[PDB]
Design a protein around this motif. Structure first.
Motif, PDB file in Angstrom:
ATOM      1  N   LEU A   1       3.767   5.980  -5.563  1.00 25.21           N
ATOM      2  CA  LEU A   1       3.686   5.923  -6.968  1.00 25.21           C
ATOM      3  C   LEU A   1       2.435   6.525  -7.554  1.00 25.21           C
ATOM      4  O   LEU A   1       2.196   6.409  -8.761  1.00 25.21           O
ATOM      5  CB  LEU A   1       4.023   4.597  -7.508  1.00 25.21           C
ATOM      6  N   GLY A   2       1.592   7.126  -6.793  1.00 25.99           N
ATOM      7  CA  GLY A   2       0.403   7.683  -7.215  1.00 25.99           C
ATOM      8  C   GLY A   2      -0.614   6.781  -7.789  1.00 25.99           C
ATOM      9  O   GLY A   2      -1.176   7.034  -8.858  1.00 25.99           O
ATOM     10  N   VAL A   3      -0.870   5.680  -7.169  1.00 30.07           N
ATOM     11  CA  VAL A   3      -1.832   4.686  -7.471  1.00 30.07           C
ATOM     12  C   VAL A   3      -3.088   4.742  -6.635  1.00 30.07           C
ATOM     13  O   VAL A   3      -4.168   4.323  -7.078  1.00 30.07           O
ATOM     14  CB  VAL A   3      -1.287   3.291  -7.620  1.00 30.07           C
ATOM     15  N   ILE A   4      -3.035   5.213  -5.435  1.00 25.89           N
ATOM     16  CA  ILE A   4      -4.056   5.394  -4.471  1.00 25.89           C
ATOM     17  C   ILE A   4      -4.216   6.844  -4.095  1.00 25.89           C
ATOM     18  O   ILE A   4      -3.192   7.535  -3.989  1.00 25.89           O
ATOM     19  CB  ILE A   4      -4.010   4.444  -3.301  1.00 25.89           C
ATOM     20  N   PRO A   5      -5.426   7.368  -3.879  1.00 28.65           N
ATOM     21  CA  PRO A   5      -5.565   8.729  -3.409  1.00 28.65           C
ATOM     22  C   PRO A   5      -5.100   8.990  -2.006  1.00 28.65           C
ATOM     23  O   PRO A   5      -4.511  10.034  -1.700  1.00 28.65           O
ATOM     24  CB  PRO A   5      -6.990   9.004  -3.636  1.00 28.65           C
ATOM     25  N   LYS A   6      -5.351   8.114  -1.098  1.00 28.29           N
ATOM     26  CA  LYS A   6      -5.127   8.134   0.295  1.00 28.29           C
ATOM     27  C   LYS A   6      -3.990   7.242   0.715  1.00 28.29           C
ATOM     28  O   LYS A   6      -3.763   6.205   0.088  1.00 28.29           O
ATOM     29  CB  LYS A   6      -6.317   7.938   1.143  1.00 28.29           C
ATOM     30  N   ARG A   7      -3.254   7.601   1.779  1.00 25.90           N
ATOM     31  CA  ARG A   7      -2.205   6.746   2.360  1.00 25.90           C
ATOM     32  C   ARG A   7      -2.855   5.886   3.432  1.00 25.90           C
ATOM     33  O   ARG A   7      -3.184   6.356   4.514  1.00 25.90           O
ATOM     34  CB  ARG A   7      -1.024   7.531   2.950  1.00 25.90           C
ATOM     35  N   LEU A   8      -3.033   4.612   3.140  1.00 27.13           N
ATOM     36  CA  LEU A   8      -3.642   3.597   3.918  1.00 27.13           C
ATOM     37  C   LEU A   8      -2.713   3.112   5.008  1.00 27.13           C
ATOM     38  O   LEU A   8      -2.171   2.006   4.938  1.00 27.13           O
ATOM     39  CB  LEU A   8      -4.302   2.556   3.128  1.00 27.13           C
ATOM     40  N   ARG A   9      -2.407   3.957   5.982  1.00 30.42           N
ATOM     41  CA  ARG A   9      -1.515   3.499   7.033  1.00 30.42           C
ATOM     42  C   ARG A   9      -2.203   2.486   7.937  1.00 30.42           C
ATOM     43  O   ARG A   9      -1.766   1.342   8.003  1.00 30.42           O
ATOM     44  CB  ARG A   9      -0.959   4.705   7.778  1.00 30.42           C
ATOM     45  N   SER A  10      -3.408   2.788   8.409  1.00 38.29           N
ATOM     46  CA  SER A  10      -4.085   1.918   9.367  1.00 38.29           C
ATOM     47  C   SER A  10      -5.129   1.014   8.738  1.00 38.29           C
ATOM     48  O   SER A  10      -5.657   1.241   7.641  1.00 38.29           O
ATOM     49  CB  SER A  10      -4.728   2.788  10.455  1.00 38.29           C
TER      50      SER A  10
ATOM     51  N   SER B   1      -8.202   0.669   9.627  1.00 43.82           N
ATOM     52  CA  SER B   1      -9.377   1.443   9.515  1.00 43.82           C
ATOM     53  C   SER B   1      -9.430   2.199   8.210  1.00 43.82           C
ATOM     54  O   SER B   1     -10.461   2.282   7.527  1.00 43.82           O
ATOM     55  CB  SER B   1      -9.656   2.244  10.710  1.00 43.82           C
ATOM     56  N   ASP B   2      -8.355   2.791   7.810  1.00 42.44           N
ATOM     57  CA  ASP B   2      -8.151   3.438   6.573  1.00 42.44           C
ATOM     58  C   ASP B   2      -8.449   2.517   5.421  1.00 42.44           C
ATOM     59  O   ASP B   2      -9.158   2.843   4.454  1.00 42.44           O
ATOM     60  CB  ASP B   2      -6.852   4.115   6.499  1.00 42.44           C
ATOM     61  N   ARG B   3      -7.903   1.326   5.505  1.00 38.49           N
ATOM     62  CA  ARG B   3      -8.077   0.321   4.482  1.00 38.49           C
ATOM     63  C   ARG B   3      -9.543  -0.073   4.354  1.00 38.49           C
ATOM     64  O   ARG B   3     -10.069  -0.137   3.245  1.00 38.49           O
ATOM     65  CB  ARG B   3      -7.081  -0.742   4.901  1.00 38.49           C
ATOM     66  N   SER B   4     -10.253  -0.181   5.476  1.00 38.41           N
ATOM     67  CA  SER B   4     -11.639  -0.413   5.589  1.00 38.41           C
ATOM     68  C   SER B   4     -12.444   0.630   4.864  1.00 38.41           C
ATOM     69  O   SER B   4     -13.384   0.346   4.116  1.00 38.41           O
ATOM     70  CB  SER B   4     -12.173  -0.642   6.939  1.00 38.41           C
ATOM     71  N   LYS B   5     -12.157   1.869   5.072  1.00 35.69           N
ATOM     72  CA  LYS B   5     -12.756   2.987   4.443  1.00 35.69           C
ATOM     73  C   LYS B   5     -12.642   2.904   2.939  1.00 35.69           C
ATOM     74  O   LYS B   5     -13.613   3.059   2.178  1.00 35.69           O
ATOM     75  CB  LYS B   5     -12.370   4.282   5.021  1.00 35.69           C
ATOM     76  N   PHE B   6     -11.480   2.669   2.436  1.00 37.18           N
ATOM     77  CA  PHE B   6     -11.167   2.508   1.067  1.00 37.18           C
ATOM     78  C   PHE B   6     -12.008   1.426   0.433  1.00 37.18           C
ATOM     79  O   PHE B   6     -12.655   1.588  -0.620  1.00 37.18           O
ATOM     80  CB  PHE B   6      -9.745   2.356   0.726  1.00 37.18           C
ATOM     81  N   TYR B   7     -12.043   0.284   1.031  1.00 37.12           N
ATOM     82  CA  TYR B   7     -12.810  -0.833   0.645  1.00 37.12           C
ATOM     83  C   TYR B   7     -14.278  -0.514   0.578  1.00 37.12           C
ATOM     84  O   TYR B   7     -14.999  -0.908  -0.343  1.00 37.12           O
ATOM     85  CB  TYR B   7     -12.606  -2.100   1.344  1.00 37.12           C
TER      86      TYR B   7
ATOM     87  N   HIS C   1       0.788  -1.171   0.000  1.00 38.53           N
ATOM     88  CA  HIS C   1       0.000   0.000   0.000  1.00 38.53           C
ATOM     89  C   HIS C   1       0.841   1.250   0.000  1.00 38.53           C
ATOM     90  O   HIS C   1       0.569   2.233  -0.697  1.00 38.53           O
ATOM     91  CB  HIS C   1      -1.099   0.000   0.978  1.00 38.53           C
ATOM     92  N   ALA C   2       1.930   1.231   0.763  1.00 34.88           N
ATOM     93  CA  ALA C   2       2.842   2.353   0.832  1.00 34.88           C
ATOM     94  C   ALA C   2       3.486   2.604  -0.530  1.00 34.88           C
ATOM     95  O   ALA C   2       3.432   3.720  -1.041  1.00 34.88           O
ATOM     96  CB  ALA C   2       3.875   2.076   1.921  1.00 34.88           C
TER      97      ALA C   2
END
Length: 49
Positions: free
Chosen positions: A32-41, A43-49, A26-27
């Motif tokens: 590389l500009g593939v994701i809008p958000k930095r999925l550190r946690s 919970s973040d990943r959950s949101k994205f999903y 994810h990092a």
DNA sequence: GTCAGAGGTGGCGAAAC
DNA sequence: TTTCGCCACCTCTGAC
């Protein structure tokens, strides 16, 4: 995978990377500009999903 | 004031104990 | 379970 890595390593200039965790993955994606958000946690990943 | 440097912090993963 | 290292960013202070 192992045969794939052997095939790639024999080439010139290409970089192959294998991730032991999705976070590092994810990092690299974010950097590389593939994701809008930095999925550190998680919970973040959950949101994205 | 901005940007870089410096350091710290924090997180995650890895390894060892 | 802790420690350690690495990575990334943010915070803090200097320098341009």
């Amino acid at each position: 995978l192992n045969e794939l890595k052997d095939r790639l390593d024999e080439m010139e200039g290409v970089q192959f990377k294998q991730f032991n965790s999705i976070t590092d993955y994810h990092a690299q994606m974010f950097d590389l500009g593939v994701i809008p958000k930095r999925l550190r946690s998680a919970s973040d990943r959950s949101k994205f999903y």
